Amino acid sequence: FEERHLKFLQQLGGSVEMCRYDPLQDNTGEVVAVKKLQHSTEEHLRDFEREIEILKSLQHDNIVKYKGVCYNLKLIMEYLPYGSLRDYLQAHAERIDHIKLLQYTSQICKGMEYLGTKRYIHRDLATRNILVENENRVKIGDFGLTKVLPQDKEYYKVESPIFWYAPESLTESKFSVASDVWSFGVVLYELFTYIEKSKSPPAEFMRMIGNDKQGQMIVFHLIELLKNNGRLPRPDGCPDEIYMIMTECWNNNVNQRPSFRDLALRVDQIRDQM
Ligand SMILES: Cc1csc2c(Nc3cn(C)cn3)nc(N[C@@H](C)c3ncc(F)cn3)nc12
Numbered sequence: 001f002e003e004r005h006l007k008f009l010q011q012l013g014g015s016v017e018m019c020r021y022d023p024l025q026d027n028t029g030e031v032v033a034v035k036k037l038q039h040s041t042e043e044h045l046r047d048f049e050r051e052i053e054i055l056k057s058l059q060h061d062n063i064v065k066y067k068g069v070c071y072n073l074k075l076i077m078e079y080l081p082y083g084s085l086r087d088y089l090q091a092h093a094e095r096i097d098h099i100k101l102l103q104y105t106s107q108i109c110k111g112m113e114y115l116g117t118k119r120y121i122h123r124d125l126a127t128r129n130i131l132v133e134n135e136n137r138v139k140i141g142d143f144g145l146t147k148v149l150p151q152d153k154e155y156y157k158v159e160s161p162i163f164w165y166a167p168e169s170l171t172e173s174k175f176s177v178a179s180d181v182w183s184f185g186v187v188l189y190e191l192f193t194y195i196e197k198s199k200s201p202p203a204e205f206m207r208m209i210g211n212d213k214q215g216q217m218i219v220f221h222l223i224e225l226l227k228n229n230g231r232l233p234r235p236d237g238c239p240d241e242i243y244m245i246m247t248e249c250w251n252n253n254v255n256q257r258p259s260f261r262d263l264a265l266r267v268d269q270i271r272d273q274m
Contacts, residue, residue, distance in 0.1 A: 001068045001070045001076050002023065003071075003072075003074070005022055005023040005029070006019040006021055006032075006074075007019060007022055009031065012083075014035060014036055014037040014038050014048070015035070015036055015038055016034070017033070017036070018032075018033060018034075018079060019031070019032055019033075019034045021076070030079075031079045032076050032078065032079055033076075033079045033080070034075070034076055034077075035075040036072070036074045036075070037073070040073075045073065048073060049073070050148075051075070051143050051146065052066075052069060052073075054120060054148070055075070055143055058114070058115075058120075058143075060110075060111055061110070061111075062107045062108065062110050062111030062137070062138065063111050063114065063140050064077050064078060064080065064140065064141045064142075065077060065078040080131040081133075081134075082132030082133070082134070084129070084130060084141070085127040085128075085130035085131070085132055085138055086130070086190070088132045089194055089195045090194075095135075098237075098239070099271060099274050101191045101192065102242075102270060102271040102274070103271065104130075104138045104191065105187075105191060105267050106264055106267045106268055106271065107137065107138050107139075108125075108130060108138065108187060109184070109260045109263045109264035109267060111140045112125070112140070112180060112184060112260045113259075113260035113264060115140075115146075115180075116177050116180075116260060119148060119149040120149070121146065121147045121148075121149060121156055121176060121179070121180060122183070123145035123147060123158075123179075123180070125140075125180055125183035125184055125186075126183070126186070126187060127190045127191065127195065129141055149176075154177075155174045155175060155179075156174070156175045156176070157172070157173050157174060157175075158173045158175065162218070162219060162222060163186070163202045163205050164182075164186045164201060165183070166178065166179035166182035167223065167226045167227065169182075170219060170222065170226075176254065178255070178257045179254075180260075181249050181259075181260065182249055184260070184263065185245070185246045185247075185249025185250050186201050186232070188242065188245060188249070189201065189232050189246050192235040192237070192238040193235045196235075201232060204232050204233065205232070208230055209221040226252065227252070231247060231250055232246070232250075241270055245258075245263065245266060249263075
């Protein structure tokens with residue numbers, strides 16, 4: 001990929017831009033998503049190459065396709081036109097029923113189950129990091145915080161998304177498949193809230209902790225709440241069997257948390273019985 005053939009179309013949200021890769025200047029070229037670093041440091045760059053290597057190594061239906069690179073390093077990916085699942089849910093909620101939410105849920109599990117075989121830990125599972133390809137397919141769209149497990153350990157030690165974090169991630173900075181399972185439970189909760197603003201994991205947890213709590217105190221109070229089995233409530237209209245999956249993902253006992261395999265099967269069964 002050559003920088004002079006990447007035509008700027010728009011800012012998507014380092015930074016992510018929508019470009020046209022048109023080498024033979026005529027607009028026939030394909031529209032791609034381009035990720036680049038804003039405040040490019042030696043440390044920020046070294047993790048970005050690991051992210052590029054992680055994406056290149058991934059070949060799955062529910063994982064955003066790697067296309068190539070561009071050198072001032074730029075990661076070139078396929079363009080998914082409906083944006084993040086977080087935005088798509090807010091926008092088209094009217095055409096999204098519980099069967100559709102479970103179809104998305106299932107796809108997220110399948111993509112996560114695949115990451116697991118590569119011994120990769122996502123660390124940032126949230127609806128904002130899930131992209132919509134079309135009305136029937138979603139993909140994990142960002143791998144910026146993804147880590148590779150040490151060959152001999154089942155975990156890894158590292159601004160963080162605290163309201164999606166497992167207790168051991170908050171207390172010990174320990175990231176594993178089980179902490180990705182914990183976050184999947186938050187993703188499932190987000191889906192069944194349909195991203196109703198007041199019902200988001202930060203909004204709910206803050207109410208439970210006290211909206212008076214500030215900065216450094218919030219984390220300790222969140223750690224305490226989770227330890228005293230305080231949990232996100234059941235979203236309105238959320239089927240009890242779906243809430244039981246969430247609560248099982250939110251087990252304080254890391255080893256008692258379900259596998260992405262079992263989760264996809266359970267979600268697929270509920271979906272069929274619906
Ligand atoms: C409004 C909108 C419409 S399409 C789209 C999009 N598409 C995209 C991003 N990538 C990496 C591939 N296609 N990415 C983004 N934003 C970027 C930051 C993005 N990248 C990855 C992700 F998981 C979620 N969002 N917004 C939109």
